[PDB]
Write an enzyme that holds these catalytic residues in place. Structure first.
Site, PDB file in Angstrom:
ATOM      1  N   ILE B 110     -78.480  -1.538 -35.949  1.00  9.77           N
ATOM      2  CA  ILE B 110     -78.650  -1.049 -34.584  1.00  9.77           C
ATOM      3  C   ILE B 110     -77.355  -0.809 -33.810  1.00  9.77           C
ATOM      4  CG2 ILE B 110     -80.914  -2.078 -34.481  1.00  9.77           C
ATOM      5  CD1 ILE B 110     -79.623  -4.264 -32.576  1.00  9.77           C
ATOM      6  N   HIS B 126     -84.843   0.588 -36.753  1.00  8.52           N
ATOM      7  CA  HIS B 126     -84.975  -0.537 -35.833  1.00  8.52           C
ATOM      8  C   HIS B 126     -84.413  -0.291 -34.453  1.00  8.52           C
ATOM      9  CE1 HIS B 126     -85.039  -3.303 -39.603  1.00  8.52           C
ATOM     10  NE2 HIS B 126     -86.241  -2.815 -39.330  1.00  8.52           N
TER      11      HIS B 126
END
Ligand SMILES: [Cl-]
Ligand SMILES: [Zn+2]
Lengths: 7, 270
Positions: B110, B126
């Site tokens: 991320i 994600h």
């Protein structure tokens, strides 16, 4: 849904 | 014993011919840039790992604490950059794309380092530390502000014993769309939430059509991501794992290359 987890 | 091949020559035979290469990347790639991942060997934030804080329930109960954690993570990216593994992957994409061969990265990470390295075909399954989503209105926004809101300035200290900032919810980050003012949350998929259906469709499309798959820096313990490369392997497609350690999935793949990705990948993808 298609769900997040850790093993 | 049943252990996959570490033959780089053999790998390279598949790589030379592949028209459609899927690369699945995890926290080990970010770890090589020094990004703290807060799972496995990736340390603790105060008393906690990601599994404890990255959950709907942690955020229900202590949204200031969860935002402290994400703020710390946002702010430390100031000193973190892509590594030779990111660059090998981006360069491979560029070089192969000029020959009409497709490379797609599917990332569990991320921190946006594959974006910064110049990867174009990127599926961030994600979400992103640098995106917000509103808990009321659902709008997603890019957000790179440092600090994200004034109340978080100098908060997020990772030391054990650090006390909760206990920022009132009204001074945490808020929607700025006309007529909402909701509480924002990081636009990151938490443990216990599902992945976006649209992204999973895009992922299945790539997995169904690829002819070579690389799983790089993945512990292969976070699902559903950990099920992607085994699914490819079961169609008879070669899967090569690049990781510093064996994992629960290792024996399902055709190759295992041990080491930091920044050492093995520039050779593999050359
Ligand atoms: Cl991982
Ligand atoms: Zn809103």
């Amino acid at each position: 849904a298609v769900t997040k987890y850790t093993s | 014993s049943a252990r996959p091949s570490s033959s780089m020559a053999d790998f390279r035979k598949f790589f030379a011919k592949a028209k459609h290469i899927v690369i699945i990347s995890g926290a080990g790639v970010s770890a090589e840039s020094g990004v703290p991942t807060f799972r496995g060997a990736g340390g603790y934030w105060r008393k906690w790992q990601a599994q404890d804080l990255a959950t709907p329930l942690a955020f229900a109960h202590n949204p200031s604490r969860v935002w402290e954690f994400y703020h710390y993570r946002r702010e430390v990216m100031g000193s973190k950059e892509p590594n030779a593994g990111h660059r090998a992957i981006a360069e491979c994409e560029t070089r192969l794309g000029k020959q009409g061969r497709r490379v797609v990265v599917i990332t569990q990470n991320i921190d946006e380092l594959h974006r910064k390295a110049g990867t174009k075909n990127l599926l961030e399954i994600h979400g992103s530390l640098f995106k917000t989503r509103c808990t009321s209105c659902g709008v997603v926004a890019e957000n790179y502000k440092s600090p994200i809101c004034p109340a978080l300035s100098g908060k997020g200290a990772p030391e054990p014993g650090t006390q909760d900032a206990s920022i009132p919810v009204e001074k945490l980050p808020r929607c700025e769309e006309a007529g909402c003012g909701g509480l924002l949350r990081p636009h990151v998929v938490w443990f216990g939430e599902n992945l976006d259906p649209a992204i999973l469709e895009e992922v299945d499309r790539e997995l169904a059509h690829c002819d070579l798959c690389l799983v790089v820096g993945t512990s292969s313990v976070v699902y559903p991501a950990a099920m992607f490369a085994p699914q490819v392997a079961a169609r008879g497609v070669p899967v090569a794992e690049f990781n510093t350690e064996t994992t629960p999935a290792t024996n399902r793949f055709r190759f295992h290359f041990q080491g930091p990705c920044g050492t093995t990948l520039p050779e593999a993808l050359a």
